[PDB]
Amino acid sequence: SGPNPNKQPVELNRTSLFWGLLLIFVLAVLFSSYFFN
Amino acid sequence: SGPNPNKQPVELNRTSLFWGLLLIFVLAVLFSSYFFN
Amino acid sequence: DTVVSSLYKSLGGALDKTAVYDEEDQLLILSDMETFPETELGRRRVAQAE
Amino acid sequence: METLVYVFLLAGTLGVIFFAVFFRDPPRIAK
Amino acid sequence: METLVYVFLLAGTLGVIFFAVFFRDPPRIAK
Amino acid sequence: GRGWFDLIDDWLKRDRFVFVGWSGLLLFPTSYLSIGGWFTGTTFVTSWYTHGLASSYLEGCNFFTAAVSTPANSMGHSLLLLWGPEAQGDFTRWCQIGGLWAFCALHGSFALIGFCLRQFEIARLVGIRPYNAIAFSGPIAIFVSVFLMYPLGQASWFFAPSLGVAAIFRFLLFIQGFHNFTLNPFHMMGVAGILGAALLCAIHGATVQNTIFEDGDAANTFRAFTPTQAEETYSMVTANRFWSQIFGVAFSNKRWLHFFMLFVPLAGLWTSAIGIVGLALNLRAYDFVSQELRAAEDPEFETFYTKNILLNEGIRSWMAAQDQPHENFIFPEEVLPRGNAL
Amino acid sequence: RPFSDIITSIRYWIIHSITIPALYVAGWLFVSTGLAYDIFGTPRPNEYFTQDRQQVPLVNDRFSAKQELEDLTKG
Amino acid sequence: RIPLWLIATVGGTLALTVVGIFFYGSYSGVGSSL
Amino acid sequence: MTPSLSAFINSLLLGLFVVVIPIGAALFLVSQSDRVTRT
Amino acid sequence: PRSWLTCAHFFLGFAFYIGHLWHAGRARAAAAGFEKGINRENEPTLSLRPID
Amino acid sequence: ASAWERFCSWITSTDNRLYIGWFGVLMIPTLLTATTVYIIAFVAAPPVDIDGIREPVAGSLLYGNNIITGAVIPSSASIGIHFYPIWEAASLDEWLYNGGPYQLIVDHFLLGVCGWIGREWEFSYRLGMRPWISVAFTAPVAAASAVFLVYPIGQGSFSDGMPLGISGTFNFMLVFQAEHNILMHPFHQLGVAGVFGGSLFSAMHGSLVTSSLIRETTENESANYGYKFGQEEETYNIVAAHGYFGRLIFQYASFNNSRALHFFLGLWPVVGIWFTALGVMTMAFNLNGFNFNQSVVDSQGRVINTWADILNRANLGMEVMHERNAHNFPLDLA
Amino acid sequence: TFRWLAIHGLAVPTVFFLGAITSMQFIQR
Amino acid sequence: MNVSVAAYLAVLLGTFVPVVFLVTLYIQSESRKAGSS
Amino acid sequence: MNVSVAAYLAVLLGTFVPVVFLVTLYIQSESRKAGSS
Amino acid sequence: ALRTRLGELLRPLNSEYGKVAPGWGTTPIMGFVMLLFFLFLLIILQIYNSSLIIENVDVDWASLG
Ligand code: CLA
Ligand code: CLA
Ligand code: CLA
Ligand SMILES: C=Cc1c(C)c2cc3nc(c4c5[nH]c(cc6nc(cc1[nH]2)C(C)=C6CC)c(C)c5C(=O)[C@@H]4C(=O)OC)[C@@H](CCC(=O)OC/C=C(\C)CCC[C@H](C)CCC[C@H](C)CCCC(C)C)[C@@H]3C
Ligand SMILES: CC(C)=CCC/C(C)=C/CC/C(C)=C/CC/C(C)=C/CC/C(C)=C/CC/C(C)=C/CC/C(C)=C/CC/C(C)=C/CC/C(C)=C/CC1=CC(=O)C(C)=C(C)C1=O
Ligand SMILES: CCCCCCCCCCCCCCCC(=O)OC[C@H](COP(=O)(O)OC[C@@H](O)CO)OC(=O)CCCCCCCCCCCCCCC
Ligand SMILES: CC1=CCCC(C)(C)[C@H]1/C=C/C(C)=C/C=C/C(C)=C/C=C/C=C(C)/C=C/C=C(C)/C=C/C1=C(C)CCCC1(C)C
Ligand SMILES: [Cl-]
Ligand SMILES: [Fe+2]
């Protein structure tokens, strides 16, 4: 039905990239020793 | 040492996306029955 | 007034009839950003930083 | 359990085919 | 074999730390 | 203002020394009824008929050993209403079955509700964003998960944290011995949040106090700040340089810093709440099965984890008899798990 | 009016040279009378145990709790 | 009319006396092992 | 009517006449007496 | 008495190390002349070239 | 214009990405050595006879541990607090048998964190910022010295220091509670107050600063971008937050002064952690927490239990089960 | 009277309980 | 049937890594096209 | 060590999927920033 | 923008956005029913909690048979 006026860009600056990567890797480190059992 | 004049953008149009996804999925289909053994 | 009339089933909601249209735009975020004047100290500091 | 992987891969290939047929880049003539 | 996964995860966290320290977005003052 | 509801609203929201608000109609009674109840239960009421303990200053306890002990285990999860089928309107028997704990806990839940509603109300009337009411959700989650959902998953209110100091220490060691809650990854995330929040508090205080701008000629620099000044009282650039070249990374954005200071403790509390909710159903990260099997088949395989498991067995066996008197556990000296000598 | 302005006022202290000690002593006679032990059911130093009751008293039923409480607290 | 420094002095003295009476009761009578 | 049901109904009545009604009456009287100005 | 003396003097030794750190830092800052704060006019950091 | 002068300028340079300075000269090698030996010993190290009874305990990943159970085991109890470098061992294998890597890592790490305190002071002097961030760091370091160094000194064995692992940390906690009753010791209670209050004030301060942020951002944009790095103006209304918090509790409680507020923020956790580190330092020499066991007796004189007694039961279970094969005599005097 | 009510609701139980506690120090078993 | 166990990781990750690579190359190109306008 | 076998897939994919999501969100955003100029 | 048959059929059901009855309207009966539903929830909560024992209401597994 044509272009949507509600379209917006999405961003993730580099500080947020490093924060997210650190969170995911640390969660993996924490919960791997519990998933393997 | 400042901005590099050799910087260029990189692209993958949607047709190429579907071609690549199809290639990867079909290779997985073909070689899964050989990796599991 | 009567019992059934008292509940005003007939009158829409017991107190409800002839409803107005609310005007306030409830989905509205204010956008009155504030400008802070640049002091002379600010100009000196940004000059040193530049 | 490998039937899970085989079925998932075949379904993924079928999904890629579906999205390629129905969400293709529409051909248009340049100017 | 889990030592492989543990070592890989710890090394990945250390690598993320390295890249965050040394390839950060440089702070600069806006204008 | 004319209508009766408008008049009540105008009076409740009056700007006086103690803001009342509509939430005050839920906070001030219940909160009061909670706190005095504690001060009553920790001062005159006993745990002799529920736990076999003395828990009041009257019985001889001090601030540490005095507590409002949980109800008897036979009560189950009864609401312990003073008019209920247990006390049946008798205040003395109600206090004797530990119904005062139910009073304090049930009034404290609604006091927390009223205080969060108070935060929302004052934020709305003052006209700021409601981030303080959402940060109190962390404490609300802690109270709900630890004092309500944990005993509701267990056999009775008896296993809830008894409201005291030594009582809370006993709850800590009981939960460790019976659930091994230190091994729980959600508890680990919670203690990470708590210690990281304390760390953020300390570093932020030191950094702000130590990058202050020279706004006076007095060695004591507290008087050199004005509440209404439109100038930052400390250097963000200098602090950023310090922490960047000392620690490699540093905050560059005050708003991000202060949201982070909010997020760390709140995330810790919610994570630990998930772990305690797990512990309510005995869904506990008690053991690593691989090491248990290896130690079962390899009697020379020892880890600090196995030593902790042995300590938990010791806690359980040497604590059950006096900690759960309703069970009537008689463990002879033969069966008690011991070590050589001591 | 401000807190220090009230505290240093003489009238405050004419009121609270009499009001505060009255209830400070009321609590004293509340417990010295032994009334707390009766309202709150707390055993005195000579009531934790008695004949045939050299063991800890415990309520073991939800609904008959009052009944066994009297039975145990007959004294 | 009464200097607030004297009020603070006497009030803190009385509060410390009450807490010390609590400490004595901690070393005497019920609640003490003796 | 069991004793528990009588106790429950009595609890509702006392909650009305000891908590809700007194607090509401006090709020109404105080709000009607001590009124804001220029509303 | 050994426990009392040892604990008390270990406590006071650590406390006086903290006092040393405080007073030595303040002595250096006051001698250099920035124990009251950072001068808004001549901030050293703004003169420094940015890292990274 | 001299080689030493150029070297001193480079060491004390504010242009290096990471400041070195003279304290960094001692910190970087020590911390790097500790990191290297810790990583190598955690991934791969033979079991260590911690208790001096020829019962090795595994702590390395390769010997059947996970990240949670892995640790660098404390030194052997036979060593005591004798210095045990590599060159004092007949072979490297028997250096690893008796937990020498723990001594190496602990010594280098303690020296490195001391260097970190000094380096924090140093950069501040170069910056021209006020000192004392260093003083705040001491509280974490003090606790680390209390657990890794002072507790072995008081008890007389490096086997008694905390293991460099997660499960070993829990083991050290439980044994410390069993032997000293740290929970009832008031300095640990002050530390608990310190950390809980630090979390409370962190959440409160962050909530109030984030709540009163001045509108400088559009609706399709993160509010954090309303602040520009290095700006002169305040990014939030201190008056709004102060008034909200005054209405929340009462006016007098709120910190109308921001500098006093941040001093209190830096003070509460630092003093709490100082007190708990000092408490561990004092329980190293066996000045234990309170012992209210059997403090309530009836008129006849028989013990009416309290919560202290029930806590004592857990402490006693941990006491009897800890180090089952190490004790030959009834009292745990060591 | 709201100021009176709040401050005295806090105070009256406090002094009553403190008097009871100071008496309770002397129970002497 | 008895099959290998790392073959699961082989198949799943050898499908995942190229697939996310292609998806990233597509999204990045599109984002750039949108940003140009 | 009798460890689980799907725990490998759990850990590795629960690390991989969020990591590639973050990397894609960063690359998309950067590409868009470059395309704007 | 687009007109459809179902859109035309359902348009009257989405044509009074923002229409509000003036004043308090039906709020008193709303509050009364709120009170009644609160009482009902309290009754059933106390029934299962066994703080409100109703004759011929045996809250137990054994009541099944
Ligand atoms: C903010 C006010 C407030 C709140 C939220 C609560 C909340 C609570 N109190 Mg209460 N309480 C209050 C003030 C408050 N209290 C005050 C001021 C006092 C001191 C006098 C007490 C004294 C007190 C005691 C002594 C006890 C409680 C208890 C309770 C709990 C049970 C409530 C219950 O089921 O009551 C019954 C239900 C109600 C009161 C709601 C009434 C609803 C309407 C108004 C009734 C309408 C009547 C209806 C038309 C009748 C028709 C007949 C029938 C067909 C229905 C709950 C946590 C109990 C507890 O904690 O046990 C552990 C308990 O024993 N409270
Ligand atoms: C580094 C050490 C450490 C740390 C930092 C923590 C941290 C935590 N532990 Mg603990 N814990 C530890 C070691 C540690 N633990 C160890 C070694 C063990 C095993 C022995 C345990 C065993 C353990 C258990 C069993 C539990 C915790 C819990 C918690 C959480 C408590 C949250 C809180 O603030 O509650 C404080 C309480 C609240 C915030 C509730 C609301 C409080 C209200 C607002 C108070 C209002 C009072 C009012 C003004 C009246 C005052 C009156 C006055 C007279 C006193 C938190 C994540 C709890 C948890 O996980 O909960 C989810 C929990 O149940 N821990
Ligand atoms: C909710 C309950 C609770 C709470 C809040 C606490 C709180 C605390 N307990 Mg615990 N404890 C609990 C329950 C609880 N406990 C229970 C139930 C028990 C009985 C078993 C104990 C038994 C117990 C013991 C026996 C001890 C504690 C200690 C502590 C403190 C730990 C934090 C500290 O001092 O850090 C301060 C900071 C540090 C220790 C960290 C040092 C940081 C160094 C300097 C730098 C490290 C650099 C690093 C290696 C590399 C960086 C990497 C880079 C890439 C970033 C704290 C006060 C400990 C304590 O007080 O120690 C002094 C302690 O010894 N507790
Ligand atoms: C044990 C630690 C702890 C305590 C004692 C505590 C206490 C407090 N929380 C408050 C606030 C906050 N706490 C916050 C975050 C946190 N709070 C934390 C942990 C704590 N918070 C943590 C870790 C965080 C980080 C997320 C925020 C963000 C706020 C606030 O905004 C608020 C404030 O204004 O602070 C200045 C204050 C006001 C609460 C209130 O009015 O409740 C209303 C309820 C009352 C009065 C009744 C209490 C009912 C309780 C649950 C049961 C009865 C308890 C007994 C009377 C006493 C038990 C004694 C023990 C020994 C068992 C108060 C000082
Ligand atoms: C062989 C190997 C490697 C061995 C390792 C073995 C081993 C045992 C492994 C450890 C495993 C491990 C990593 C597991 C951790 C798992 C765990 C429990 C994770 C918790 C995760 C979780 C989701 C918790 C939720 C709570 C949460 C959000 C906590 C976050 C904590 C956190 C990062 C807090 C901040 C800490 C911190 C250091 C802050 C520094 C800030 C700093 C630089 C200040 C800068 C600054 C301050 C100012 O004030 C001003 C003004 C300016 C300008 C300024 O700049
Ligand atoms: C000589 C000795 C040198 C030793 C230096 C060692 C420094 C270590 C660096 C850690 C930073 C990690 C990246 C953080 C993420 C990051 O890039 O943040 C960078 C971030 C910059 O934020 P800005 O304010 O620039 O961001 C504003 C924007 O976000 C807009 O919203 O600063 C911080 O928040 C860092 C403060 C927390 C610093 C502690 C981080 C947690 C450390 C834990 C690491 C895990 C260890 C596990 C290993 C298995
Ligand atoms: C409980 C219950 C049952 C059923 C119905 C009923 C409505 C009655 C309901 C509610 C009852 C209520 C709310 C009762 C009220 C009682 C209250 C508020 C009691 C509180 C008493 C307060 C006390 C001791 C305070 C003692 C304080 C102390 C030492 C302080 C120590 C200190 C001193 C002395 C000097 C300086 C240092 C320091 C630490 C500050
Ligand atoms: Cl021995
Ligand atoms: Fe700040």
Chains touching H, CB cut-off 8 Å, 3+ pairs: F, G, K, L
Chains O and F touch (3+ CB pairs under 8 A): yes
Indicate if ligand 7 lies below 6 Å from the C-beta of H15: yes
The answer, for B29 touching chain M at a CB cutoff of 8 Å, is: no
Nearest CB partner across the interface for F81, out of I11, I34, I35: I11
Indicate if ligand 4 lies below 6 Å from the C-beta of K249: yes
Q: How far is the CA of K147 from the centre of ligand 5 (A)?
A: 21
Gap between the Cα atoms of F149 and F308, Å rounded: 27
Q: How far is the CA of K288 from the centre of ligand 4 (A)?
A: 29
Q: What SS3 class is residue K165?
A: strand
Enumerate the residues of chain J whose CB falls inside 8 A of the CB of residue E26. 50-52
CB atoms near residue F123 (< 10 Å): 22
Residue with tokens 């030959």: K328
Of the ligands numbered here, which is closest to the C-alpha atom of L24? 7
Q: 3-state secondary structure string, J5-29?
A: HHHHHHHHHHHHHHHHHHHHHHHHH
Helix, strand, coil shares, percent, chain I, to 5 = 80, 0, 20
Tokens of H30: 């019920």
DSSP label of G50: B
Residue type, position H27, single letter = Y
The answer, for C47 touching chain E at a CB cutoff of 8 Å, is: no
DSSP label of F67: E
Chains B and M touch (3+ CB pairs under 8 A): yes
Q: What are the Cα distances from residue F261, in Å, to F135, F267, K4?
A: 11, 11, 44
Tokens of K7: 């070297």
Gap between the Cα atoms of O16 and K249, Å rounded: 44
Gap between the Cα atoms of G24 and G37, Å rounded: 19
Indicate if ligand 3 lies below 6 Å from the C-beta of K197: no
Tokens of O40: 């009902």
- The Cα of O23 is separated from the nearest Cα of chain I by a number of Å equal to 18
Resolution (angstroms) stands at: 2.5
Gap between the Cα atoms of I34 and I20, Å rounded: 21
Contacts of G18 (CB under 8 A, 6+ apart): none
> K83: burial class by Cβ within 10 Å (0-12, 13-18, 19+)?
exposed
Q: 3-state secondary structure string, chain E?
A: CHHHHHHHHHHHHHHHHHHHHHCCCCCCCCC
Indicate if ligand 6 lies below 6 Å from the C-beta of K224: yes
For residue I8, which atom of ligand 1 is closest to its CA? Answer: 36
Q: Which of residues 1-37 of N touch B (CB under 8 A)?
A: 31, 34-35
Tokens of O35: 């009170």
Q: What SS3 class is residue F231?
A: coil
Gap between the Cα atoms of F71 and F67, Å rounded: 12
DSSP state string for F317-331: HHHHHHH-GGG----
Which residues of L carry a binding-site annotation for heme?
8
Tokens of F37: 């109840």
CB contact under 8 Å between F291 and K311, yes or no, is: no
Q: Where are the beta strands (DSSP E) in chain K?
A: 71-72, 164-165
K177 contacts K169 by C-beta, under 8 angstroms: no
Gap between the Cα atoms of A36 and A24, Å rounded: 17
Residue ID of nearest Cα to ligand 4 atom 47: F31
Minimal Cα distance from H26: which residue of K?
K295
Residue with tokens 């304390």: F198
- The Cα of J47 is separated from the nearest Cα of chain K by a number of Å equal to 11
Give me the long-range contacts of I7-14 (CB less than 8 A, separation at least 24). Answer: I7/F81, I7/F83, I7/F84, I7/F85, I7/F88, I7/F89, I8/F83, I8/O43, I8/O46, I8/O51, I8/O52, I10/F83, I11/F81, I11/F83, I12/O39
The phi, psi pair for K164, rounded to 5°, reads: -85, 60
CB contact under 8 Å between K67 and A29, yes or no, is: yes
CB contact under 8 Å between K128 and J3, yes or no, is: no
Enumerate the residues of chain F whose CB falls inside 8 A of the CB of residue K273. 198, 202
Q: What SS3 class is residue K162?
A: coil
Q: Which of F35, F57, F113, F146 to mutate to test the pocket of ligand 2 (most atoms within 8 A of CB)?
A: F146
Residue type, position A20, single letter = G
Gap between the Cα atoms of N13 and N15, Å rounded: 5
K78 contacts K51 by C-beta, under 8 angstroms: no
Q: How far is the CA of O5 from the centre of ligand 3 (A)?
A: 69
Enumerate the residues of chain C whose CB falls inside 8 A of the CB of residue O25. 13, 15-16
Chains I and B touch (3+ CB pairs under 8 A): no
Q: Which of F30, F40, F42 to mutate to test the pocket of ligand 7 (most atoms within 8 A of CB)?
A: F40
Enumerate the residues of chain F whose CB falls inside 8 A of the CB of residue J46. 237
Q: Which of F41, F56, F73 is nearest to F328 (CA)?
A: F73
Enumerate the residues of chain G whose CB falls inside 8 A of the CB of residue K309. none
Q: Which of residues 10-29 of E touch C (CB under 8 A)?
A: 29
Q: What are the Cα distances from residue K273, in Å, to F198, K231, M6?
A: 10, 34, 48
The answer, for H3 touching chain F at a CB cutoff of 8 Å, is: no
Residue type, position E21, single letter = V
What distance lies between CA F119 and its chain's CA centroid?
19
The answer, for E31 touching chain J at a CB cutoff of 8 Å, is: no
Indicate if ligand 4 lies below 6 Å from the C-beta of F136: yes
> F30: burial class by Cβ within 10 Å (0-12, 13-18, 19+)?
buried
CB contact under 8 Å between O2 and A2, yes or no, is: no
Gap between the Cα atoms of D19 and D7, Å rounded: 18
Indicate if ligand 7 lies below 6 Å from the C-beta of L16: no
Q: What are the Cα distances from residue K299, in Å, to G14, G53, H34, K170, K282?
A: 44, 15, 11, 41, 37
The answer, for C39 touching chain J at a CB cutoff of 8 Å, is: no
- The Cα of K230 is separated from the nearest Cα of chain E by a number of Å equal to 6
Gap between the Cα atoms of F36 and F45, Å rounded: 13
- The Cα of I4 is separated from the nearest Cα of chain O by a number of Å equal to 5
Contacts of G30 (CB under 8 A, 6+ apart): G36, L16, L19, L20
Q: What are the Cα distances from residue F287, in Å, to A35, F180, F311, K321?
A: 12, 8, 13, 18
Indicate if ligand 3 lies below 6 Å from the C-beta of K276: yes
